[PDB]
Design a protein around this ligand. Structure first.
Ligand SMILES: [U]
Ligand SMILES: [U]
Ligand SMILES: [U]
Ligand SMILES: [U]
Ligand SMILES: [U]
Ligand SMILES: [U]
Ligand SMILES: [U]
Ligand SMILES: [U]
Ligand SMILES: [Zn+2]
Ligand SMILES: [Zn+2]
Ligand SMILES: [Zn+2]
Ligand SMILES: [Zn+2]
Ligand SMILES: [Zn+2]
Ligand SMILES: [Zn+2]
Ligand SMILES: [Zn+2]
Ligand SMILES: [Zn+2]
Ligand SMILES: [Zn+2]
Ligand SMILES: [Zn+2]
Lengths: 136, 136
């Protein structure tokens, strides 16, 4: 794939990840061909560790709104995210920026595509994943 | 920046990160302009949570080699990674694939650049960060 990075900041992040999984100072950062990195740490003594370092996602709660006093009928289960992402990218090419199942019940799903133009396209979909609305 | 993704797989990863920080099924995935995502989860009851989701790096130990029976004189401290990454990219443009301070003592530092050509350039540097060697 596109193995490697041009970012000192990323390499430093990868050194830092490894630095907290084992003792010793960093003596090698190496891109494996899957997408992961191997970092070698090395103690004053000469003890070598090898640390795998992967892209992770960390999730922290930001807000909260207790029960108004209805759950959701539909949801962004894995099926549903994959449908919307095709449907949306078919209708307009670019980066997906928003998916929601909030909607207005006859258009239950929404996606926002961002485009080279830096022009946002708010797309509206039927329960059956057909385009029913655009806003460019 | 390049806000968004064309990857259902990434959105599903982001939904999954959030799914494990709070209860409820996912009803919104939204890219914030820093680089993070907000996921809204929603319980059967109607309780909304918002979850921040960031790029993280996770580090797991892979191997180990106890003391042969010398630590490292030099190391890839943050200073040193930033020097090598410029020095290397100056000498040859592309993605950095390896940094090491193993070397042969008169060339204490090494970098590997990967290039559009898919041609690897193994570069060799003095303690003073000058190029002393290439291998194309
Ligand atoms: U390795
Ligand atoms: U990621
Ligand atoms: U909320
Ligand atoms: U949204
Ligand atoms: U938000
Ligand atoms: U990253
Ligand atoms: U090792
Ligand atoms: U290396
Ligand atoms: Zn609130
Ligand atoms: Zn899943
Ligand atoms: Zn489903
Ligand atoms: Zn709608
Ligand atoms: Zn809309
Ligand atoms: Zn071993
Ligand atoms: Zn640091
Ligand atoms: Zn230093
Ligand atoms: Zn060398
Ligand atoms: Zn070399």
């Amino acid at each position: 794939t596109g193995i490697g990075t041009a970012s000192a900041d990323e390499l430093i992040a990868i050194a830092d990840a490894a630095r907290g999984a084992a003792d010793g100072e960093v003596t090698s950062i190496d891109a494996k061909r899957d997408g992961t990195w191997e970092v070698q740490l090395t103690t004053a003594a000469g003890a070598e560790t090898e640390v795998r370092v992967d892209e992770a996602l960390v999730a922290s709660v930001t807000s909260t709104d207790a029960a108004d006093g209805t759950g959701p009928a539909l949801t962004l289960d894995d099926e549903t995210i994959r449908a919307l992402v095709s449907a949306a990218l078919a209708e307009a090419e670019g980066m997906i920026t928003d998916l929601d199942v909030d909607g207005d019940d006859v258009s239950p799903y929404d996606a926002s595509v961002l485009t080279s133009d830096n022009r946002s396209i708010d797309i509206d979909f039927s329960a059956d994943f057909a385009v029913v609305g655009t806003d460019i």
